[PDB]
Structure formats: C-alpha cells, structure tokens
Design a protein around this ligand. Sequence first.
Ligand SMILES: N=C(N)c1ccc(OCCCCCOc2ccc(C(=N)N)cc2)cc1
Lengths: 186, 186
Amino acid sequence: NLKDKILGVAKELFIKNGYNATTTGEIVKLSESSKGNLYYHFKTKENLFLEILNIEESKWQEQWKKEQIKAKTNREKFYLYNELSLTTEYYYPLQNAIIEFYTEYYKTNSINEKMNKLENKYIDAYHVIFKEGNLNGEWSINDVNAVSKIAANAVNGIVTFTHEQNINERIKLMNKFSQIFLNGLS
Amino acid sequence: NLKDKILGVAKELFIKNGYNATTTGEIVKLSESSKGNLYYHFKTKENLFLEILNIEESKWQEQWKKEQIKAKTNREKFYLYNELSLTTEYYYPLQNAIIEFYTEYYKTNSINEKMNKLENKYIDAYHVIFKEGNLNGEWSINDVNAVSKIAANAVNGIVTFTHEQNINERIKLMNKFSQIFLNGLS
Ligand SMILES: N=C(N)c1ccc(OCCCCCOc2ccc(C(=N)N)cc2)cc1
C-alpha cells in the first residue's frame, strides 16, 4: 500500500528517533512519495503523527481485548494489562516521541486537544477495569476517573522510565506495583 | 572555574536553544575557553551535558534536604517529595533540553550507562524515605530497593504524562496517588 506504507515508515523513525528528530524529508526519501501526498488525510506532519498515534492506540486496545479473556477477576485484569504494557509492540514504544511532541505543541490549542482526546482511550481500559470491579464488588473506588488517570500515568511511567534493564526485572517491578496499587484501593 | 564557567554558560545555552542546536564552539567562545580545554574536561557535548545534569541533581538534593524538615514523618516526606517534583518540574527550564537529550541517547550505551548512575541518585531519595519509614514503624517494607524504583518511575509518569491538565488537578491526582500507594504498603 502507500497511504498505509508511509504510516509504517514514519512510525519506525518516530520511534527509532523522535518527533523533532525524524523529518518529512526523511519520511519521503526512505518511503518514496511526493510531498503533497502527506497533505490530504495528512494535513501537517503533526497530523501524520497524531495518525500513527491513533492506529497504535487502536491496535493495542484491540489486542488487549483479545487477551483480557485470560483474566477472570478485574483484579487480575489490572495485573495483566500492566504486564502486557511492558511487552506489546503497540503504542508504548512511542512514548518518548510523544513526550517530545507535547513539549513543542502545548503552545498551540489544537494540540492540547487531540493529545487530550487520545487520553480518553488511554485511560479507558482502567475505567472499565475499575468500574467493573466496583460492580463485581472487588473493591470500592468513588473517584474512578481520578484512579484511572493515576494508574495509567503511573504505569506508563514504569514502562517508560525503566526501558533499559532486563525485561523480567521490569515485569517483576510492574507486578509489585499492581500489587501495592490495588492493595491501597481498599 | 574556567571549567565551572563552561558549565554555567553551556547550561544557559542549552536552556535558550536546547541540546541539538547548541554547539561546543558557542560554548568555547562564550566562556572564553578553548576546544582543547573543553575536550580535556568533558571529551564531548554529551558528556558535558551529563556533567551539567549531575550538578543539577546535587542542587536538587540540597534543596530536598532543606525542604524535608517541613515533614516530621516519612509518610509526610513521601507526600511532600512527590508534590515538589511535580511542581518544580512544571517550571524547570532545562526539562526540554533534557527531554531532547534522553530521547536521543537512550539508544547508545556510552551515554545510557551514566544516565543510570544519575537516575539511581534520584531513586535514593525514595530509598532513604522508605528505609527510615521502616525504622520508625511507619510501615514495613522488605523490598526497599524495589518499592523505591517503583515509586520513582510511577511518580515520574504522573509528572510527565499528565501535562495536559490545570495544575491543581495534577497536584490533586499526585496526592491521591501518594495516598493510595502509601496505603497499599501498610
Ligand atoms: N539552583 C537550584 N535551587 C536548583 C537547581 C536545579 C534543581 O533541579 C530541579 C529538577 C526539577 C525537576 C524535578 O523533576 C523530578 C521528576 C520526578 C521526580 C520523581 N519521580 N521523584 C523528582 C524530580 C533544583 C534546584
């Protein structure tokens, strides 16, 4: 494909480099396509980027739904989601670029928007898990929205700022995290 | 001194223009030094920047030392340290140069080695708090190093990824997090 082949190349650079880093020049020279191409569906370069962010979040959320089945209690769904976060090839590998992207677009208002709409998906999984856990009586949270935001950010932190040491050590910490977090909910 | 003048000038340049655009040549002339002297003290821009980061960490340590007297118990020092981290990073001018530097060297090993000596210094704050907490029956944790790595990165995610919300909300969420987390340890 083409419209779907650019996405694929940019994704690679954005990760393999960063937002500021990788450039529309490089995107094109490693992919092969005129400039305008990136102008219809791809308004700006930050449009191509918010696009990739959309796919990835979709894909990771899809995979998680095709995987949460292995977890009976929501308590277990919480643990599972946090460990899978460490291994997916989706979304989380773009956190640095995103961090960077935000530190240079928070100055526009069209940014504090999309970058905040994508946040709804991001925290949704925890919302379902947490609200469902309330219905299922596993715990009793009155500020589900706050708790979901906190879990998602905390977890994205462990996933993102421990990205150097051994994966089993990480999975270990993440499980100890899920342990402590949930134990503090009640 | 000439060494400290290089550090001070570079720090300002990195803040005004960020990492990528700042050159050792700018640094040499503005501090009235030489490529040779700069080579002798730091070898490279990356190294120079890492040295700056260590000085910054010390300054941050010394500041924590004074501010933590506002907290009798370690339960308090925990709440206070997290809140501080969120508020001071909100207006820390080096954060962009730092974001630009990490997301651009978390691939190399030359650099990625030291970053961890540095990241470990930051995690120590938690280690001290938690150990002290044990010795005063505020809690009993048997995996101090571990809970410490977790608190550090979890807090870190909350500081880094919430960046699209009004400041009191973020402080509200950070404090809620400290409450939950400290609750799951008891
Ligand atoms: N001249 C001075 N007085 C001075 C100079 C530099 C300084 O350095 C501030 C660094 C601020 C950014 C603080 O960033 C974090 C992020 C996360 C955690 C955490 N997760 N614990 C802790 C700190 C402090 C004081």
